[PDB]
Amino acid sequence: AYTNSFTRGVYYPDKVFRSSVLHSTQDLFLPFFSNVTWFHANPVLPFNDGVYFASTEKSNIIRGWIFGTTLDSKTQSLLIVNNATNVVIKVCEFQFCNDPFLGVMESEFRVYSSANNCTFEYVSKNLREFVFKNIDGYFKIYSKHTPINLVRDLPQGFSALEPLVDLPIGINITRFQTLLALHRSAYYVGYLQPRTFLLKYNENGTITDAVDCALDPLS
Amino acid sequence: ETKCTLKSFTVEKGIYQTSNFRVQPTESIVRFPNITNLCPFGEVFNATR
Amino acid sequence: YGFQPTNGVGYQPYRVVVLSFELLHAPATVCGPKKSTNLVKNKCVNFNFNGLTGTGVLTESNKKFLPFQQFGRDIADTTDAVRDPQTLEILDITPCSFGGVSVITPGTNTSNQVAVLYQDVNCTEVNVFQTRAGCLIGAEHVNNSYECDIPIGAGICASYQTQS
Amino acid sequence: YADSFVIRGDEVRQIAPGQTGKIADYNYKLPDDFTGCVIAWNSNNL
Amino acid sequence: SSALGKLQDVVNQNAQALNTLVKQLSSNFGAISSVLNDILSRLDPP
Numbered sequence: 001a002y003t004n005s006f007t008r009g010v011y012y013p014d015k016v017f018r019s020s021v022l023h024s025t026q027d028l029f030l031p032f033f034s035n036v037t038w039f040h041a042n043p044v045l046p047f048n049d050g051v052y053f054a055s056t057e058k059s060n061i062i063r064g065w066i067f068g069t070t071l072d073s074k075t076q077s078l079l080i081v082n083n084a085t086n087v088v089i090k091v092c093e094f095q096f097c098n099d100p101f102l103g104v105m106e107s108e109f110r111v112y113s114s115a116n117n118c119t120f121e122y123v124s125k126n127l128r129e130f131v132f133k134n135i136d137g138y139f140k141i142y143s144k145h146t147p148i149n150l151v152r153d154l155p156q157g158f159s160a161l162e163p164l165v166d167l168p169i170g171i172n173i174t175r176f177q178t179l180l181a182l183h184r185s186a187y188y189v190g191y192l193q194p195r196t197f198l199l200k201y202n203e204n205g206t207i208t209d210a211v212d213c214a215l216d217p218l219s
Numbered sequence: 220e221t222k223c224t225l226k227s228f229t230v231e232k233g234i235y236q237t238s239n240f241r242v243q244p245t246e247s248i249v250r251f252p253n254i255t256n257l258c259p260f261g262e263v264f265n266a267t268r
Numbered sequence: 269y270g271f272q273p274t275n276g277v278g279y280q281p282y283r284v285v286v287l288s289f290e291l292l293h294a295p296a297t298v299c300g301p302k303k304s305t306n307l308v309k310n311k312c313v314n315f316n317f318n319g320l321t322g323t324g325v326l327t328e329s330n331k332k333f334l335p336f337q338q339f340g341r342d343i344a345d346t347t348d349a350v351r352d353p354q355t356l357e358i359l360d361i362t363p364c365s366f367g368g369v370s371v372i373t374p375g376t377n378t379s380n381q382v383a384v385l386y387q388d389v390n391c392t393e394v395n396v397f398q399t400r401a402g403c404l405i406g407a408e409h410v411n412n413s414y415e416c417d418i419p420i421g422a423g424i425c426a427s428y429q430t431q432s
Numbered sequence: 433y434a435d436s437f438v439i440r441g442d443e444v445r446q447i448a449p450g451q452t453g454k455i456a457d458y459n460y461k462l463p464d465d466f467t468g469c470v471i472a473w474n475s476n477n478l
Numbered sequence: 479s480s481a482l483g484k485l486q487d488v489v490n491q492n493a494q495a496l497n498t499l500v501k502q503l504s505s506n507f508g509a510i511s512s513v514l515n516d517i518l519s520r521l522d523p524p
């Protein structure tokens with residue numbers, strides 16, 4: 001299936017506060033009214049320039065992503081996981097199952113079978129959006145958690161995404177996947193292009209509205 | 220100063236812009252995030268073997 | 269090496285560490301620990317917050333950033349606020365007073381007395397009389413109204429009477 | 433002004449208007465507003 | 479109380495010009511940055 005975003009995938013493109021103004025930016029955005037894939041419950045996707053990624057549930061079936069160029073050994077990759085404990089970022093050379101996942105006893109993690117040469121570690125319904133990008137050896141992640149009053153369909157509205165993480169890795173990326181918690185006892189993928197937007201800033205400094213300046217003559 | 224900026228030993232009545240003025244910085248300050256990690260240069264320079 | 273404690277120097281063991289700094293072609297990496305001097309307020313200073321470099325006078329403010337926002341800027345894109353990275357308090361930035369200087373002359377063919385106007389400057393930062401055109405030094409403020417002789421501005425004029 | 437001396441064969445490019453180097457930063461400097469000639473010829477036979 | 483466009487236009491023109499003047503303090507014109515404290519920090523005087 002395919003679906004239509006309406007006004008989705010807007011993130012704060014810098015750390016700068018702004019009071020009641022209209023500011024114009026050039027960056028990598030998800031164009032308004034786009035053609036976003038639909039997935040149910042998954043396969044190896046491309047990256048090619050950033051990614052928008054939403055998801056919907058009350059349980060937690062979406063348990064992180066895996067990135068990289070080959071998703072195996074012989075080249076390095078990232079791995080972002082969340083068991084019922086908390087997030088586990090990790091950067092080694094792995095050996096990934098071609099269909100990697102984790103179970104739910106509640107024993108799991110048939111994800112990889114190798115953790116060699118680790119160069120970075122870290123340990124510690126609902127709509128959960130994420131924007132992933134990778135520039136100059138930094139892997140930036142923006143995110144937002146809005147509550148839907150549906151269960152698993154893409155809604156309409158405006159909600160800007162706030163920066164979360166910054167990782168000075170150096171890693172090359174060309175592909176990525178997803179991770180799901182099996183049954184033993186809905187998600188979308190947009191892509192980002194270089195656009196020019198007009199963001200409206202509140203008096204507290206939040207982005208409340210935007211204009212995509214390449215949609216139509218009025219814009 | 221008027222005679223210099225007007226290039227003349229006589230000046231006529233009026234008001235004349237002669238120079239600018241500005242306050243100079245008293246000192247310098249520096250701010251930066253707290254302290255964390257700072258690398259553990261005690262494992263290689265402090266090994267038992 | 270058969271090391272033994274009763275060996276002359278130059279035969280006793282030395283431990284060696286060789287640090288080798290390399291610079292491939294990445295985006296960045298390890299660096300030194302930048303210093304951090306105290307933070308003053310209400311004086312023209314040269315500040316530096318994390319790399320934000322400028323000069324001016326810092327006061328405390330009534331803004332509220334967003335937890336991830338590190339400094340503010342206005343229309344025309346000048347920095348007019350900042351967050352300091354240790355208190356987590358936001359501070360207003362105001363340029364350090366400046367202006368022009370004008371001299372009021374009654375004509376050198378009449379006198380050598382002069383008055384001085386410091387344009388749009390408060391009088392504290394330089395008998396002494398505060399106009400809306402700036403701070404005026406060397407002229408007496410009388411209460412009568414004459415025709416304008418030398419225009420000062422915002423309704424005020426000056427003149428050489430009687431002698432002053 | 434004739435300034436006459438002897439150097440190592442490498443830092444002959446260190447006698448130039450405007451530069452950085454261990455010979456130029458410590459033992460001999462020329463202004464960036466230099467005006468004149470620089471002559472160098474080899475010597476281990478003297 | 480419910481037309482002064484000729485007075486509004488001269489205000490607008492002057493403000494639009496003063497803003498364009500300040501917005502030019504952030505162009506390179508073919509330099510490495512727009513800040514003098516950045517050319518005086520990663521370049522030698524020559």
Ligand SMILES: *[C@@H]1O[C@H](CO)[C@@H](O[C@@H]2O[C@H](CO)[C@@H](O)[C@H](O)[C@H]2NC(C)=O)[C@H](O)[C@H]1NC(C)=O
Pocket residue numbers: 260261264265
């Ligand atoms: C290795 O560890 C020791 C002990 O923690 C450090 O020795 C300290 O050195 C300082 C400065 O010379 C003294 O004031 C302390 O008294 C020492 N420690 C003790 C326990 O007395 C030493 O500096 C460390 N080496 C390095 C390279 O950091």
Ligand SMILES: *[C@@H]1O[C@H](CO)[C@@H](O[C@@H]2O[C@H](CO)[C@@H](O)[C@H](O)[C@H]2NC(C)=O)[C@H](O)[C@H]1NC(C)=O
Pocket residue numbers: 253353354
């Ligand atoms: C950086 O370290 C300083 C230590 O001086 C911390 O200062 C204290 O801040 C806490 C707030 O969490 C106050 O309750 C204390 O009264 C402060 N003590 C002193 C001596 O200033 C500061 O909080 C730390 N900042 C960060 C980023 O954690």
Ligand SMILES: *[C@@H]1O[C@H](CO)[C@@H](O)[C@H](O)[C@H]1NC(C)=O
Pocket residue numbers: 002003004034035
């Ligand atoms: C998205 O692109 C596919 C490509 O064939 C097309 O079939 C589909 O109709 C498009 N969806 C929308 C909403 O335009």
Ligand SMILES: *[C@@H]1O[C@H](CO)[C@@H](O)[C@H](O)[C@H]1NC(C)=O
Pocket residue numbers: 081083085086088123
């Ligand atoms: C969650 O997964 C990480 C991945 O290595 C692991 O380190 C951690 O121990 C797991 N949680 C528990 C409770 O074992």
Ligand SMILES: *[C@@H]1O[C@H](CO)[C@@H](O)[C@H](O)[C@H]1NC(C)=O
Pocket residue numbers: 116117
């Ligand atoms: C990465 O792992 C392989 C196999 O374990 C090893 O041969 C190689 O030396 C490792 N890389 C580095 C930089 O040591």
Ligand SMILES: *[C@@H]1O[C@H](CO)[C@@H](O)[C@H](O)[C@H]1NC(C)=O
Pocket residue numbers: 170171172
């Ligand atoms: C990423 O892959 C490209 C392939 O064209 C390669 O040229 C580049 O060096 C790789 N990135 C890094 C940091 O080596």
Ligand SMILES: *[C@@H]1O[C@H](CO)[C@@H](O)[C@H](O)[C@H]1NC(C)=O
Pocket residue numbers: 202203204332
């Ligand atoms: C945030 O914005 C709202 C509306 O714009 C305003 O009423 C409020 O005072 C602001 N500050 C808050 C909520 O701290």
Ligand SMILES: *[C@@H]1O[C@H](CO)[C@@H](O)[C@H](O)[C@H]1NC(C)=O
Pocket residue numbers: 377
């Ligand atoms: C200027 O001085 C000369 C010489 O004393 C005099 O003749 C002339 O009247 C003066 N001009 C005036 C008073 O306006």
Ligand SMILES: *[C@@H]1O[C@H](CO)[C@@H](O)[C@H](O)[C@H]1NC(C)=O
Pocket residue numbers: 390391392398
């Ligand atoms: C000048 O400074 C004084 C001293 O704080 C202040 O009270 C006053 O409001 C300022 N402005 C004028 C126009 O006096």
Ligand SMILES: *[C@@H]1O[C@H](CO)[C@@H](O)[C@H](O)[C@H]1NC(C)=O
Pocket residue numbers: 409410411
């Ligand atoms: C000018 O007149 C006012 C009347 O309100 C008075 O308060 C003030 O002291 C007078 N100043 C002088 C210098 O006479």
